[PDB]
Symmetry: D2
Subunit: 505 residues, 4 copies
C-alpha cells in the first residue's frame, strides 16, 4: 500500500524536454494567463499565454482561408500531408506519450497506446484519401446520368477532453484534413501541452509539404474561448467529445458529432469464462483510473455466479498496483483533480445509502506522498437494484454489481440508463451472444462479446446512442460527417420534359 | 370556368370513401378541410389534442416493440402491399391532392406515382440495409457493423407535397423496422386520412401490428407535442425551431426547410431547352415547390434575349382550374400566399428591379376566395435582400454575370442550399459547376432544372435548408442506429 | 396411390395453356416432355437446331442494342410486371415444376415464390447498380467508376431447380440491361416454356423489345452452340467443360456445379434441432439439391445417439406422390439416378461402411417406370473415395471426429465447396467454424443446414463448385461491365 | 538527330550498385543459366542462376505454408508489413528506378514514377487492411442473422511483363499481402534484376516485422517455369499482365486476373483544344516508346480538323528527343529488343501497303552509336480505313490516324477492335463527352475525357474488356479478386422450419 511519486520539478523538466523535442518554442507559448498542470502531483507546472474570443474568431477566419485552397487540393495530395504527420508522430512517439502521462495521468503503456492510435488513424486516413466514395447510379430519365459526390465541408471545430488529450483530435484532424477540411482545436483547459506539441509537429509536416499554414490551429483558453468556437457561423461542423453544444449548433444550422460520456455495462452469464471475465472487467473498470468514456461502470451478473464473481473481483481490486504512472509497475494512476475525487466519494457514500455494500477499494492512497494528487483504489460496490446513483455516471473507478436471472432482464438493466455508449456480454453460449447483439438486445453504439466496454479500434465507427449524443468518429464511413453530399443529374440528351406537352419554343 | 365548391366537396367525399375512410368517424367541428380551387371550406373534421398525440406515440411505440423483430423482408411485404393499394387507388388519391394542394392533375398523379415508386425501392432495401464486416487488429476476434430499428418516427409534412414526403419517410421507416406518427399540414388533412386508411388496409392484409402508422390532425400544439416527445427518436420535418428542440433532448432530425434555387445560363446554353426548363421549374406548382426555380443567373451577352423569351413565355402560360388538362398553373394555396407574393414584387421594384411579366391576379370574379396569379419575372440589378430570402410564390428573379466564378458565387451567396442547375454546352463549365468549389447545394445539375431529382437520389439540401436527406441512396441510415460489434472467440484478453 | 400419366398430362397441358403457351406451336416429334412421377413420356416437342441458337442470339443481341439504353428503372418496371404475372400463375407454374422435377408441391410453390422474390429485389436494384465516385490525384480532374450493360447472357439450368435459377439470372440480367438466351435441361422443357410465355406477356404489356428472352429447347449440341457463341459475353451454368471453353474466347462465366455439403455436429448441439435440420437437408427434394446435406461430421461422444435418432427418422420418412401433401420425399428423376445411388451405396459398404437405414426402392409395382427410394444413412470409418465424390441422390454419410480443427479439415478436404453448417451451443466453436481457417465453403452457417440460404445473400461456392455467385448482395456486377472514367476539366495535361 | 549512349560496362556497374544497395547478394544470384540484359545497348550484363520447374513447386509449397500462418494474422498487422515495405521503397526509390531504366529502357522520370506507384499502392493497401469490407444484411428468417465475410484465398501467382517491371507486381503483392495471401512472382525473362531488388527489400521488411519468410518469392526462369506456376493446384489465383493462361487456369477451377494488351484510341472532336490534344496525344503515343499496354495507337479525328491535327502531330513527332533514357533531355528511349523493332517495321510497311501514308517517324535512330539497341522515332501514319494492320496491335510507337464525321461513327471505330483497354475523347462539348462515356459509347475498361489513354491512377480499378481479358487490379474494390466471399446465416432461435410440419422429435 505504498508508492514513490515523481516531484513537480522532475515532471516539469520532462514536459519541457518533450515540448522542445516536438518543436514547441517555450518562450513563445509561456505566459501568465493560464497554467499547465499535472495530476501526478496536482501542481501547476508553468504559465501559458491564452487566446481571447477575438483570437478564436481570427483563427477561424484564417482556417477558412486555408480551406479555400485545401478544398481544391487533390485528396491524395492531402493524404501525403497526413502521411508526413504520421512519420513525425512515429519519430516523437515517446516524447508525446510523456506529455500524455504528465497531463492526463495515464500509465506509460496507455499513453504510448494513445499516441499509436494517432499513427494508426493517419495510416487509415491516407487510405481514405483515395476513396471518399460516393456512388454512380441509374437514372429514370433517358439520355441522363446520375451520381452522388462528396465535397469538403469547411472549418471543423474540435472540442476534446482531458482523458484522451491527443487521440480524439487525431481521429478528427486526420479524417478532416484528408476530407479537405481545416481544423480549429480547443483542447481541455486541463491538457494544453499535449495539444501544443501535436500542433507543432503538424506545423512541421505542413511546412515540409508546402501546404497552407492555417490547416490546423490550437486555441488555448477557458470556456469563453470554446463558446466562441461553437457559435461561429464559419464552422459548419463541431465535434465535441467527453452538452449545450448540440442545440446551439443546430440553432445556426450547423452539424455536430457528439460523444458525451457513457455508463457502460457488461453482462456476465453462467457460462462465462471467469478468468477471462475477471481480467477483462478489471482492465475495463480500473484502466485510466476509471476515466474513459468507455469505462466499465456496471456489471450485471447472473445470480448463480454472482458471489464467486464478486469474490474474485474483490481480490483483483485489492491487488491493483496504484502509483506513479511513469513506473512500469503501476496499473492505476491518479484521478485528474480534487473535484473528481470529491465526486467519487460522494457517489460511493450515496450508493451505500441507497442499500449498497462496498466490497473493495474506494480509499485515497498515500495522501502524504503527493498531497495535491488523488490516487485512489477502484471501488467495487454491490447494489440490490439499479438506483439513481448507478444510473447517473460518475467519472471515477466505481464498478456497481447488479444481479439478474433471465437474459431479457440483463438486457433491460443494460438499456434502462440514459447513456448508450458501449456494452459487453461474457458468455460461452452461442444464442446468448447473438441475443445480446440482436435488435432487441443491448441498445448501445458498441456491443461486444467476450471483450469489455473499451473493446474498439480505429477501423470501427466510434460513438453512442441516447444521451451519449449519436455521433460517430474514426472508422468505417464516419468520414461522411466531415463532407457534404451532392446529388448530380447530368442531361446529355438536349431535351427536357415538356409540361403538359407545351413547347415554349 | 372554375369547378364549383359543391362538385369539389362531392369528389373529395367519394375519393375518401373509396380509399377506405369512414367519413362519420373523421367528421367533426374542430378543424376544417378546405380547397384552394375556390377558397371554400369543404367540411369540418375532428381534431386531436396534445394528449391524443401522447397516446398515439404510445401506440406506435408498442407496435415498434413487435415490428423491430419482424424480419425486414417480411416488413417489405407490407410495403409491397401498400404500393399495390396505392396503384389501385392512384386516381382517387390524386383527386384529393389536387383538391387540397391545388396542383394540376398531372402533377397530382405524379406525386402519387412517387409514392408507388418509393414503395418498390423500399421493398428492395428490405433485403439490404447493409452494414459492414471488416478485419480487426485483434487475433481470434471478428468485427462488424450492424444496423438496427430506431423507434417511433415523427413526420411533419407541408401542404405542397401532401403525400409523397410522408411516403418517402414511411416506406423507408417501415422497412427499417420503425413506426410512424404523422402530423400533416393543417391545410391538407384529407390526403393524409386517405393515405392512412389505405395503409391500414395493407396492415390488416399483412396481419401486421395495428399501430405502425397513425395520423394526428390538429394545429401547432399537436405538432409541438410530437416534436417534444421523449419516445420519438427521429423527427422528419419539411416546410426551423424543430432542430434545436429535438437536439436538446438528444433526438435526431431530418430537416428540409425550403429552397431558393438558382440556375446559371451560360453563353453556350441551348436557349430553347433553357427557356422550357426555366418556365416549368419557375411556374410549376404555382412556384410552391421546395425545388422551385427562383433565381436565374444569366450571362450578360445573352441576358436580353433570354429575358425577351421568358417574358413571351410567361405571358402565354395557361392559368386556371387544376382539374382542366389545359392548365399549367393552378392557384396559390391561400390569401396569405398571394399577399406575400405581392409584397415581394413591391419590394423588388423598390430595390431597383423591373417587373417584366406577370404578377397580376387572374379572373378574381370567377372565384373571389381563390388566388390564381400569373407567375412574375423580375429583372434585378443585384442580388438584393428580396432575392436572397425566398417567397413561396412564382417569382423568377433574373441576375446577370460575366465570369463563371461570379455566377457560382451568386448561386452560393444565399442562406438556402437545396438545388442548383447550369445550362451550358461547355464541358468544362459543366464540370466546374459541380466541382468542390462550384455550386454548394445538395442537388447540382447540368442541363436540367432545379426540380431535377428522382427516387434513387438522396434528396435534401445544405445550409439553412437543414442538412437532411430523404428517399434514395443510403438516406435510410437516418432511420436506424449503427452498432459496432467486436466478438472474441479466442478465450484470451487482447487489448488494442 | 400414384397419380396416373393421363391425369398428369392433362394437368400439364392446362397449366401450359393458362400460362399463355400455344400448345400447337410447341408440340412436335424431336424431343419429349416426361415426368418422374411415373416415368412416362407426356408428349412430343419441337426442338431447336444449332442454327436456331445462332438466330436466337442474333435476336437477343438486336434486342440488347435497344434495352441497354432503356433507363434501368424502366427496365425494372418490366421485371415488376413479370413478378405480378408469376404471382397470378404461381399454382400453374408450381404444377409444372412438380410434374417435371418430381418435387413435392410445397417445394414447387416455394421455388416459384423465389422467382417472385428475386423480381422484387431486382426492382430495387434497378435504381442502384452502384458504382463509385472518388478523388483523383490530378488537379482539376474528376474520377468515377460506372457500370454498363454487358450483352447477351446464356443461361444453362438443371432439372432440379427448373425455374428459380433462370429467374435469378434473368431478373438480374434484365434490370442490368442484358438480354437472355436460355437453354433449360432436356428433362424440364415445359417449365421453361411456361416461364417464357409469361415473360413474353410482360414484355408486351411493357412495350419492351420482343427479343429480351428466348428459350432454346434441345440436346447437347444446342447448349454447345450457345456456350461457343462470340456474341454471348456471359454464360451462367448450373449443374465443367464450360469454364475453359468460354475463357478461350475471352467470355465470362458464372459456374455453380454441385455440392458435397457437410454439417458438423458438436457435443453441445441441440439434438432435436440437429436431427430435424439434417433430415430435411439430406432427404429434401430426394437428395437432388445442389445444397443437399451429404456428409454429417459428428463428435465421437454423441455419434451413437445421433445415428440412432437419424435411423429412426429415416425409417419414418413418408415417400410417395409429390402431389400428396403427406409426402416428404418424391421420386428420383430417372432410372440412371437410381442406378448411381445404388452404385454409391454398394461402394460405401465395400469401403467399410455400414448401411444404417434406407436405400430400398419403394412400391416398384405402383409405377414401374418411376424410382421412389428411401433416403440412405451410411456410417463410414473415414472419408473414403465414395464420400468425397458426390452422388446426386439421398445418401447421408456419417463420419466421426474429436477435435474441431479435424471436423473442419474433414469438411474442407473434398473437391466441392458449396455449403457447410455447424450445430453447436458453443459461441467459440460457432465463430471458429466461420473464421478464415474454418469452413472453406461459399456458404457457412450456424445452427441451420446446408440449404440455409436466401435471396438477399450471394449464392454459390468455391473450389470445384466453380466460384460463381448469383442472386443477392452484389452478384449483379457479373452481369455488367465496369468502366473507370477520368474527366479533365482543367484544360491542361497533368500526368500521374 | 544524334545521341551519346551509355556503355554496357557503365550500365552494369550502375545495376550492380543498385542491387547491392537494395540488399541483393550478387554472389548468390549470379550464375550461368540465364542472363540479365539492357535495351539501352542490347547487351547482356551478367549471368544469373535460374529456378527449375521443380523449384517453382517448392516455392509454391513454401508460400502455402506461409499462407497458413498469414491468413490468421490480423489484416491490420499484415498492413504494418506493407507499410514497412513502402518505407524501404521510399528509401531506395532512386536505386530501384535505376534498375527500371536499365531493364525496361524507360526514361528516368517514368522510372521514378513507376517506383512511386509502388509506394502509393503500399499506402492504399495499408488503408485497405482495416477495410476489406463485406456486409451485414437482414434475413427473412426470424431469430437469425445474415452476413457476408471475406477471407484470404491462398497463394497468388504473379506473371508480369517487361514494360512495368515493378508496379504490376506491387499492385498485386501489396493488395494480396494485406488480403492474407502469399505471392509467387515470375517476372519477365527480360527484367529479372528489378524483381530481385524488389524481393530483397520486401524480405528485409519481412525480417523487421517478424513475418513469415515465405510471403513472397521470385522465380527466375524461362517459359517452363511460368507454366509450372500457372498449372499449380495450390495457386488459386493467377494474375497475368502484358493468352493461354485463362483457359488453363479455368480447367483446374482456378481464378485469373488478365490484362493482356490494348489497342487504344482517342477521338478528337471539332471543338477539341488542339494544344491540349497534341500534348496529350504525343505523351500517350510516344511515352515508354509506345510500349505501355495503355499506349495510344489509334487517333480518330473529325474530318474538319484532321489536316491541322496531322500537321501539328507531324511537327511534334519530328521534335521528339530520342536518346539515352538516363539523360534528362530524353523523352523516347529504346524499344526492348530487335524482335520489337522488326515487328514495328513490318507493321509500318503493311500499313503503307493497305493504303496508308507515313507522315512522320518510323526510322531507326543512330544505329552505329549502339548497334545492339533499337532507338526509333515514333511513327505517325494516316490511314484511309481501319484495316487489319490497324486492328492488330503492334507493341511499338505507331499512331494510326483515322477520320470520321458523326460521333456515333467515331464510337464504332473505337469499339470495333478486339481489344478493350482504354479510350479517350478530346472535346469542349458537354454532350459529346457524356455520349462517349454512356452505355452505348466507348466499350473499354477505361474511358476518359480530355486526358489520354494512359490516364489512370492507383485509386481506380485498372483493366479492360474483350480480348484484353476482363481483369481488374489496383484500386476501387479490385481487392475482392484476392479473397473468397462467404455468406453466413447464423440461427440463434433454437429452431428450424419443419418440412411439411413434421417434427422428427
Amino acid at each position: 500500500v505504498t508508492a514513490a511519486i515523481s516531484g513537480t520539478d522532475e515532471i516539469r523538466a520532462r514536459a519541457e524536454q518533450a515540448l522542445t523535442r516536438c518543436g514547441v518554442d517555450l518562450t513563445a507559448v509561456k505566459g501568465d494567463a493560464l497554467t499547465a498542470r499535472t495530476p501526478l502531483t496536482g501542481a501547476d507546472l508553468f504559465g501559458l499565454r491564452a487566446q481571447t474570443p477575438e483570437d478564436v474568431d481570427r483563427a477561424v477566419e484564417a482556417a477558412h482561408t486555408a480551406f479555400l485552397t485545401w478544398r481544391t487540393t487533390p485528396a491524395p495530395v492531402r493524404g501525403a500531408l497526413v502521411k508526413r504527420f504520421g512519420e513525425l508522430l512515429t519519430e516523437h512517439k515517446q516524447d508525446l506519450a510523456d506529455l500524455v502521462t504528465i497531463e492526463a495521468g495515464k500509465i506509460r503503456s496507455e499513453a504510448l497506446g494513445e499516441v499509436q492510435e494517432m499513427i494508426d488513424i493517419c495510416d487509415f486516413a491516407v487510405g481514405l484519401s483515395r476513396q471518399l466514395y460516393g456512388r454512380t447510379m441509374p437514372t429514370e430519365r433517358p439520355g441522363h446520368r446520375l451520381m452522388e459526390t462528396w465535397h469538403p465541408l469547411g472549418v471543423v471545430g474540435v472540442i476534446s477532453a482531458f482523458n484522451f488529450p491527443v487521440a480524439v483530435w487525431a481521429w478528427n484532424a486526420a479524417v478532416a484534413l484528408v476530407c479537405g477540411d481545416t481544423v480549429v482545436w480547443k483542447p481541455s483547459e486541463l491538457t494544453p501541452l499535449t495539444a501544443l506539441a501535436c500542433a507543432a509537429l503538424l506545423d512541421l509536416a505542413i511546412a515540409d509539404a508546402g501546404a497552407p499554414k492555417g490547416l490546423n490551429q490550437v486555441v488555448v483558453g477557458a470556456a469563453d474561448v470554446g463558446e466562441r468556437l461553437v457559435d461561429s457561423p464559419r464552422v459548419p461542423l463541431v465535434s465535441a467529445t467527453g452538452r449545450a453544444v448540440g442545440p446551439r449548433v443546430a440553432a445556426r444550422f450547423g452539424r455536430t458529432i457528439l460523444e458525451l460520456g457513457g455508463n457502460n455495462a457488461a453482462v456476465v452469464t453462467p457460462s462465462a469464462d471467469l478468468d477471462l471475465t475477471v481480467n477483462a472487467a478489471v482492465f475495463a473498470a480500473a484502466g485510466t483510473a476509471g476515466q474513459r468514456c468507455t469505462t466499465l461502470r456496471r456489471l450485471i451478473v447472473h445470480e448463480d455466479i454472482a458471489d464467486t464473481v464478486v469474490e474474485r473481483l474483490t481480490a483483483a481490486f485489492e491487488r491493483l498496483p496504484i502509483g506513479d504512472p511513469f513506473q512500469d509497475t503501476t496499473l492505476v494512476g491518479p484521478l485528474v483533480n480534487e473535484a473528481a475525487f470529491g465526486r467519487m466519494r460522494e457517489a460511493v457514500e450515496r450508493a451505500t445509502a441507497e442499500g449498497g455494500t462496498l466490497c473493495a477499494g474506494g480509499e485515497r492512497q498515500f495522501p502524504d506522498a503527493a498531497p495535491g494528487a488523488y490516487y485512489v483504489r477502484p471501488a467495487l460496490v454491490r447494489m440490490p437494484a439499479q438506483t439513481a446513483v448507478v444510473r447517473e455516471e460518475t467519472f471515477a473507478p466505481i464498478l456497481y454489481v447488479l444481479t439478474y436471472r433471465d437474459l431479457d432482464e440483463a438486457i433491460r438493466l443494460n438499456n434502462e440508463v440514459p447513456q448508450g455508449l458501449s456494452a459487453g456480454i461474457f458468455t460461452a453460449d452461442q444464442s446468448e451472444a447473438e441475443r445480446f447483439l440482436a435488435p432487441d438486445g443491448a441498445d448501445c453504439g458498441i456491443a461486444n462479446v467476450n471483450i469489455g466496454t473499451s473493446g474498439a479500434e480505429i477501423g470501427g465507427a466510434f460513438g453512442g446512442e441516447k444521451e451519449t449524443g449519436g455521433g460517430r468518429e474514426s472508422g468505417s464511413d464516419a468520414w461522411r460527417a466531415y463532407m457534404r453530399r451532392a446529388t448530380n443529374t447530368v442531361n446529355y440528351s438536349g431535351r427536357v420534359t415538356l409540361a403538359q406537352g407545351v413547347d415554349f419554343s
